[PDB]
């Protein structure tokens, strides 16, 4: 029974670590999409400037 | 004191291989 509880705790810690890694893998794309939206002048500007 | 009831076995000399004094 404590083997089952300890395996459940290992699954909890592994799910939390996978949650952290998945949080960075989505946060990295979020920062990339923020930078790509920050260095983007709109098309009503670049139809003439370009 | 603190040595009021204890036996002493050996000592630890400060590298005095022929001298007996010191600390």
């Amino acid at each position: 029974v404590e083997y089952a509880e300890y395996v459940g705790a290992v699954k909890t810690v592994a799910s939390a670590l996978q949650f952290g890694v998945d949080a960075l893998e989505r946060g990295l794309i979020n920062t990339v999409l923020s930078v790509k939206l920050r260095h983007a002048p709109p098309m009503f500007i670049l139809q003439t400037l370009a | 004191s603190a040595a009021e009831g204890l036996f002493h076995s050996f000592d630890l000399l400060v590298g005095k291989d022929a001298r007996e004094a010191g600390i």
Binding site: - | A2, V14, G22, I23
Partner: protein
């Protein structure tokens, strides 16, 4: 492209150690290797004074061994070392390419 040649001057520092400096003459120093082991702040001194053999008075006395005690100071020196995170992540992974 080799663009420009800059010269910088780092500062040479004469690094000192306690045996290298000269006031270690005063202090016979040891390596006690764990200072938690001594559990009394005082240290017993066995002072044994010799005797001078007088003959005319015929008044003999032994070596008047008297014992005093003296304290043991303790100190606590502390500093910081600033190692970077990326250098430790480099050091954890042994490379093979030059």
């Amino acid at each position: 492209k080799f663009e420009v040649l800059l010269g910088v001057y780092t500062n040479a520092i004469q690094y000192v150690r306690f045996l290298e400096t000269a006031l270690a003459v005063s202090c016979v120093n040891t390596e006690f290797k764990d200072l938690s082991r001594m559990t009394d702040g005082k240290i017993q001194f066995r002072i044994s004074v010799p005797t001078i053999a007088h003959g005319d008075g015929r008044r003999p006395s032994k070596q008047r061994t008297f014992i005093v005690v003296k304290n043991c100071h303790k100190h606590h020196i502390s500093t910081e070392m600033e190692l970077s995170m990326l250098d430790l992540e480099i050091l954890h992974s042994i490379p093979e390419t030059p």
